[model samples]
Every structure is written in C-alpha cells, then in structure tokens.
Target: HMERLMLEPVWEKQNEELSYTEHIIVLFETERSVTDSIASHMKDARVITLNEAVGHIAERYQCYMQNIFELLQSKVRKLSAGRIIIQAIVPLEKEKQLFAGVSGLFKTAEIEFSKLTAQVIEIEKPEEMIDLHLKLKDDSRRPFDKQIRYEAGYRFVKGWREMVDTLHMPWRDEGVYLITGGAGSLGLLFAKEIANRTGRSTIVLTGRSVLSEDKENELEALRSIGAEVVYREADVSDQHAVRHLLEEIKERYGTLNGIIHGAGSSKDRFIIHKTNEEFQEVLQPKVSGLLHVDECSKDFPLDFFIFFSSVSGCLGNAGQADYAAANSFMDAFAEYRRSLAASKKRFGSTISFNWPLWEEGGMQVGAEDEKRMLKTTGMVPMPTDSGLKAFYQGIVSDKPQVFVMEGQLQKMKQKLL
Candidate 1:
C-alpha cells in the first residue's frame, strides 16, 4: 500500500509571471550583502529581522515562523494578490533546515488565503542572493517552489523518489526496544511487527495516557507472540518522567537496544486561527519529547533511533502548520542525533520516517475528507503490511529521512512543482 521515497532537489526553469508592487523580505538577521543587494535593486523593498517582526527574540524557530505567518495573514487582507510578496530569506545550514521546512508548510496553509503569496528562499552561497532578487524583480517566477536552494548559479527544487523494494529489519533477537506513545494504534501496530519479526524481543510501550482494556489486550497479543511486552505511564515531554522510565527499563531489561519515537499530538487549524497553546500541544511531544528521550538515553547502546515523522513535514498540508512544524523539527533532530552519534563513536543509526496516513492507525480523516484528499493529493492510507515493510527499510537504510506514502507519484509531483 505504500513505497519508501527519498527527497531529492531537481533543477528546473522558472516561467511564471508573479509581479508585486509591495515586497517584504524577512531575514533571520541582516546579512549585509543580501540586504544591501536587494536594497540597491529594489528601493521600495522592505527588509526586517525575524526578531523585529516577532517583537522579541525567537527561541523556537517554528513559533517564529508561525508569528510571521500570522502577521502576513493580517496584512495580506489589505493587499491584492499581484500587489504583495513576502520572502523569508534563510541561510542553508543544518539547523535552519527546520525553518525552510516549516516555511514551506506555512505556504501550503496560506493557499486558503487566495491573495497571499509567501516563499522561503534558502541561500547556500551569499552571492547567489542577488540572483534570486533579480528573478523576483522580474515577472518570471517559480510558482509552488516554496522551498528552493540557491548555490552558485544553479537552483534545485525539493522532490521525492519511489523506492522499489522492501528491506529487512536489523533488530537483534531478544533486544529491548522502547516505543513512546506505545498504547496508540500506530504504536500497537509497530509493537506487533517487532513481536512477529523478532519473536522474543522485549518491547516497552510508554505514554502519558492510561492503558485501556483494548490496549492491554493488544499488549497481551504481543506477549502471545513471545514479545515480553510492558506498558509504562509517562509523558515523554516530561524530562524527569522520561528519566524515571529509562531507569525502570534499565533495571528490568539490563540494557536498551533501540527506540521508536511514535509519540505526537496534532490540533489542526489554519495558521491565522491557531493559538500558541495549540502549537505547543502539537510541538511538545515531537520536539521536547525527542530531546528528553535522547538526553536520558545518552549512555544506552541504541542500535537504531526511529522518529515517526509525517508527510505534512515533507510535503506541507493545509490546516497542519503546527503539526508540520513539529514533525519537521523531528526530521532535523534525526540529523542532529546522527551527527552527534558519529562524533561520540556511538552505535545508533537515527532515521526519521515521514509517513503518510496509515489504513489502520494514527490520525484518521473522515470518509469524505479522505476522499477529497485522494482526489486532490492522490495519497492513499498506507496498509499496515506496507507500512511495516517501509519501517523495516528505514531501520537498515543510511538516509537520515525517508518519506513513505501510497499514492500516484505523478500527481503528487504536480502538486510539489
């Protein structure tokens, strides 16, 4: 029901006409060359720091983008489609990738505001800033190229590949694995897969919610398959709770071998209508949650660390700016953890799987909404068997991120383009 895909940036020519009378370029900070060059070319263009727009220092990049988005939404109503353009110029770096990713998702959300247009230009070379400025000044533009990287004189667009075959899970026999949000549907699905695949593995499921009878039955089913299943009540976002949970695991299991970070929350709303509390609700589990788990398990010999990200992060979805931002942070965190592991000579392969809707688990759309999504986005709910195959493929793959979805690739590409 699904295939593993890799995101690749492909070069393409800009042909669309997108002229605007008012231009706002939001910068992380004032890069002299970038600001000065834009100023010289377009005297009317306004450049402002992200901090200035947000009214203070931005500790969280996602919130910073969210604030900027709300500001634009308010301003866009007063202007016409061709009369205004907002460009958030971000530097090409590991940490800043979250900004680029979140910005792209925000743009998708902005599509509901018909007259609003926004872009996140990622500059690899400072000098290439002028090239984008020149392109913007002219009417010729790349529409829906929300996240683009400029390096030297070339341009690249974000893309994805359809993986052809499945791979085996690299799980060791009797290895102990921790799955956050373990009582959830996705968690139970993965626990069953581990139980079936690795026969005698120890699977610890952690969550803030109490284990219901149904969930307990699922755990019993895993135990029936020879998995030593255990359910612990703890919120991953709570560092102390995560520490205690790890201590309990260490005491019982001797040593942890891997982790499946499936814990997440989503309160879908348009960027303009969404509250900060709602954003925090969506962000806490994936952002701080992952941090807590990683921080507490620093000494554990984790063979693999899998973060369950989503397609909303890979290819932005409407009404999911907060959700997309949280998942995007997870994707970046995966890269961050992998680099840290390498530097410390650690034993884990960190990979973030950007999954689409599953047939049996995770967030479910209403029947009509699912039909609409299929018509517009061409994404199908991934069957459990295919999702498990993709999950196993991610464990053995070297890529920091993998996008899994069941859909018409051509139609999906059209949306991306």
Candidate 2:
C-alpha cells in the first residue's frame, strides 16, 4: 500500500507529466487537530487550526488549487516568495481507504504529486479521527519528501466545525502579463490566476489553435470564474498576427501590464529516426513562436513578458530532439528578454521546462519519429505550486539571470552547472 502511494504518481500505468524533485511532505492524521498537532511537533511551520466542517470538500479543494496555481501564474521576476508557508486542508474523505478515488482524479491533472502521503483514520467519533490525524505529522524533519503529499481519508464535515479558512482571488494592477498558448492547460491557468490575483490587469493569451474547441471551452470556463481574460487569436509563427495582438493590447488595455508566453512546440521522436521536417516542426512552434511573439511585443507597453519553455528544451532528451529544441528556445529566449530589459529599464523572464515527457496536455511526439530526440533529458525534480511560487517570488524580487528553488540555489548550481 505504501509502495502504491510512492510509485503510483511516478512510474504508474498511466502517463505522467511533471517531476517531484522538491520536498513537500503530506501527513494524513485524523486523530487530533491537524494543524495543532503539527504546530506542537514542529516550530518551522506557522500552523493555524480551523474548527470547520468538511462538507463540499471537493469544491473547497478546487478553490484552494485554483488559488495556489494562479499565485504562480507569472514567471519568476513578477512575484517573489515572502516565505509564505502556504498549505490547504481538504475536508473530504477517500473514496476507498485513503485518497483512492482522488488519485484517479489526479490522472487528469496537469501535474501529479509524486507521493501523495495520505493517512486515513476512520472512527465513529470525529474527535478520535482528528486526534489520530494530528499525530501523523508530529515529526517535522523526520522525512518530509515522503510525507508531504500524504492525505487523510475524506471523512466528514461536522456541523460543529467552523470551516475557519476561506479562499478568494484578488488581483492588482501592478504587473503586466502575456499568456501564450493562452488556450493551453498551463497558459490559461497563468492568465486566469494573474487576472484574479493581480487585481484585474491586462493579459494577452496567444495560441496556435485559436478557434479550437479547447479555446472556446477554456474562455467560457474562465469567464464563468469572473476572470477578465483578453485573448489574442495569434499563431506565434505569424508575425502579422503577433503585431495585431500588440496593437489590440495597446488599444484595449491602454497599456501593457504583463506578458506570459506559454506557447509550446514539439516534434517528439527518437533522434535516429526523425524526419527533417519533424525536427524543424518542433522548433517552428517552440522556438520560432517565441521569436515571433517577442518581435510583436518588442514595442508595446510591455512591463514584464514571461516566456514558458519546457524542460525537454533544457537538457536534450532521448526521443525528443524536436521537443527539447522547443524548450531550448525558451531557455535562451528568457536570456534575450533580460538582455532587452535594459533598453527600457524593465525585466523580462522565462521559466524553462517545469513539465515532463509523456504527460497529458504536454508533448505528443513519438520515439519512432526522430533521432536527435534520443538522449532523454533526465527527469525533472518538479517544484510544487508553492515551491514554484517561491521561485517566482525570488525572480520578481531579484530579477536574477537564473533562479532555483529556495534554500537550494547552491544545490541547483552544483547540479545544473
């Protein structure tokens, strides 16, 4: 069962996308006060307890996920971490024992937790479950990585519970955001989050498939959530469309607040068997798309333009020459955004490949398609929405040429270099 918890997210039967290379422990204790027990045991975390019912836990959990995910919408350089110990409690029980049914829900998520540490303490008395759950995480530093993703069973939401904490979205007009692949799983998330969090600023969502059902569905979904999503129907390859998008932004928002380009490209295939076109096709979207978008936004009221590049583009991966090449463009493009930042007294940022191969809403390239795609980039050690957010906060504050996960910058340099 423990092995199921550990290996399920990683080497599972279904396809996986992101990596879990950071420390995010989850301890599911349903005995005593969850936050209180951990607070009693560990001094590092500032724990607050809420006597709340666990009713409608899924909807509440969704809100938290949206909040956390949106908070990291901007690339590094727009937002910095204030050492926020952000966490959430889902007042829901597992379908079977622990997070049984929910794990299946994870199959559809963009990023999957490597080890969802869940502790299911079932009892007739809610107090006993609460007491039991609290004891699970009394040891703070015992082994965080394996435990952070843990969860207690989705038990109950007693009327006596107050539901102490509530989640909401608040956006300010301080930063400008450009969302590429605006219609994508990641791009839209970045845009919606920014709009709600940053107090309703101007955002541009660029994409290749502008009229696809995904685009319509995505827009409607965002609108339903009260997000002011300003989408541009532009293919990053079409220079004219890119220019028009910039013009539209100038006319609509009156000025640029932020830019997030998550538009991705890929021709995933083995290096040895890829066709010339397949190799170039990946670059056309990932690399060329970036160049085209930059050229368009070169003269707008661009405060901060963020480019979303993939991990495959960073360390060349096997069966992913074209795909890796796409991300490489973003890695280098970010440097370019920074270089140009000096001309206008602003900073541009890019986050390369927090994503992984064979993941949903990611790459569809194949091994038999190309040759240079042969050397697989070693799996990425993904950061949680929190870890990733902290990285974003570091960039927004310092605008460093490169930044890594907090408390591990040196570790990244040692490994990356």
Candidate 3:
C-alpha cells in the first residue's frame, strides 16, 4: 500500500526470465525500510539483492553516473572473489560501465554463483575506482612482499578451488578421459592421476609426439595402478587424426566420461620478432587443434573438457601476447560448447572446463620465471608429481565442476600472518 510503484514491479515484470541462477535482480530503494519489500517480492528468487547504493530505485535510474561504479562492483563481487584485470586506468563511470558490460558475460557464462570468493580489480582505472599509484599496503611495500602475497594468494585461491572441486564429477559410464597433448609435461601428469582414480578404466592419450622410453615407462606405472591406458599417435591440430580417433573411439567404447582437450604450443616472440613460420607453427597447434577437438569430439559423450590454459592468458605477459590470445580464445571456445548445450540444434554434450596450470608448461619456462620463482617459491621447479594426484581425484569427485591442484588445503593459516 505504502510503496514506490516504479521500484518493485518493473523488476517484478523482468523477474520471469530473470529467475534461477541465470538471472539476478538487484533491488534498491529510497528508504532503508524497503529492503523488506524488495526481499518480499523476490521470494525464493535467490537474490533480488539489496544493492549498496543511496537512492530510490527510480532515482537510481537517472543517477546511473553516480551509481555505475557501485552497481558494477556489486554485480561483480556477486560471484564471490571475482577478479578483473584492466589494461589501463579510466574514469570512474567508464570503469563502472566496463564491469557492467562483463557482468552480463559472467551471468551468461553461469559464473555468477555465490560461495565463490570475489576479487574485482579494475587495472589501469586504479585511480578512479581506488587510490592512484598508492603506496603498496605495508606488506606490499616490502621488496619481497609481492612474492609473499602471491604465494599466499595462490594457496588461498587453490584452497577455494579445491573446496569447490570437491563437488564436481562425471557419470561413470560417460567413458574415458581423452587428453589431446597427452605426451607433454602436464598432459602425462594428468594421465597418471586419472589412471589411479578410475580403477583400470580407459584413458585415450594422443598428441603430436609419443612418449619417450622413460615417459612411456612412466605411463606404464599408471597402468600398474589399474589403468587401462590407450596410447595413439596423432597430431592434435590435425582433423584427420581427430576424425580417425573419434572413429576408433566409437568402435571401442560405450561413451566418454571426460574430454581434456589440453593441447597448445607457444611461439616465443614479440609481434616484431615473430616470423611467418613461427606464427603458423603456433597457430596450428593451439588454434586449429582446439577447433578440431571441439568439432571431432562433438560426437563423443564427455563430461569434462580442460584446455590446459596458461596464466599468461589471464594477465597477458609481454612477448607472449599471441600465445595468451590463442589460449584465451580456447577459454571462450569452451563457453561456446557449453552454450550450444541449451539450443534446439545444440550439442548434447555438456562439459566442465579449466583454464588451469599457468606458467607451468610452455608459458613460463623462460629464465626470468625460473629465477623469479625461486625467490618466491623458495626452490627451483621440477616435474609436477602432486598436481597429478589432485586433478585425477577431481575426475571422480561428485560435484564435477571444480579445478584441482595439490597445495591448497592449508591455505588459510598464512593469510592473517
């Protein structure tokens, strides 16, 4: 009876398409008292959330300029620690619009769930959204602080990823795990882990090259743990290989339980330093290889598809922009697969994905990361033994929607210190 009509009903009308996790309605009010009204109308609707803004919902319409940053940040942090990396700083309102634009992407991608910690940072627009060129937090000011912060952050993030990883798994009869770059450093590591968990179930391994004598023996060790390992020689970027392999799979198995499409290569050069062959070489493996797997695996019944993406893809490390862009496309490409699952002519297969293991393989093997990591990581790197264990554990876990890694469990103790 005592209500601002413009406020609740418009959002009310829009609420149908906006129902479920796919849609979220943010309710703002002129008075703090309206929190009850907004919540009442949005009953069982997840979040018709009371946005932390200062006007009537109608007044907020014209005050988009003032509320833009708050609104944007609000939507972003909705996903829990949502992290944003901006290329350069911009004005406040513009930054808000930037986040608003991507908020749609996050929701459309279904990444806007609660329980996921959110960390939204607008990179260059640091001055407007936050303090500009500010002194690093006392801890950040230390010469060695970024290292400490990073290690701390890594463990923290890894812990949360594991807790979420705890919920995800695929149907057992979904068939075997298919890794594209199965012969590479990270690929075989995942292979061993997957082998141990499934109890002699099949894993189809294919790549541009086969394993060496030692690596071959290493795979055999996974077989000793009751894994039915299948090794095939095929180019990850080749359609023929992908097509023939699909044929072999159709002939061989009932259905695919997981598809880890983790195949990519890096051409180490800046735009100026790159050659035509180098460009073509990198393009074929990471780019074409991704497309071939998506197309060929269209027929296979797979529950998970992980394209071993790099951290460089996230922050865009210099000289590796090309590599980053390609892997970034793979990340988007995975979403495309998920999108197709909902349509009339949609691909029936639904798969979970991971853009995981940054700086581990092709992207971070350079001299600088080697030295830089030792300063932070406290030691030189070696082949990933424990990471293998976590990923394979994830394959059989119940939730079937998490990324796994070793070192995430004891993450919180260091955070306060």
> Clashes per prediction?
0, 83, 21
Where model 3 places Cα greater than 4 Å from the true spot, the runs are 1-168, 171-174, 344-368, 373-417
TM-score, cand. 3: 0.51
Q: Write the per-residue lDDT of candidate 3 for residues 349-369, one digit (tens) a residue.
A: 432333333336543463776
Give candidate 1 regions above 4 Å deviation.
Answer: 1-17, 29-43, 51-59, 79-83, 125-140, 151-154, 408-417
lDDT string for model 2 (1-417, tens) is: 000000001211211112212212222223355555555555544443333325232222222222232332321122232211223233323311222112211211112222322121223333434444343333221222211222344322111100101232223455446777777766655655664566545555667664677677766766665556666667766667777777777776656656666665554444334555565455555555666666666666544555555434333344554454355445544544565566653434433323432222333533453222222212223324533353354344433223222223333334332
Alpha-carbon TM-score of each model against the true structure: 0.84, 0.48, 0.51
Span of 10 residues, lowest total lDDT, candidate 3:
3-12
Ranking by lDDT: 1, 3, 2
**Number of the top-ranking candidate, with TM-score as the measure:** 1
What do the candidate models score in CA lDDT, each in turn? Answer: 0.71, 0.41, 0.44
Best by lDDT: 1
lDDT of 1 by residue, 36-105 (tens): 7776776677776653433212135646756665765577555543556677776766455455655645
lDDT for model 3, on a 0 to 1 scale? 0.44
Give RMSD (Å) of candidate 3 vs. truth.
17.4
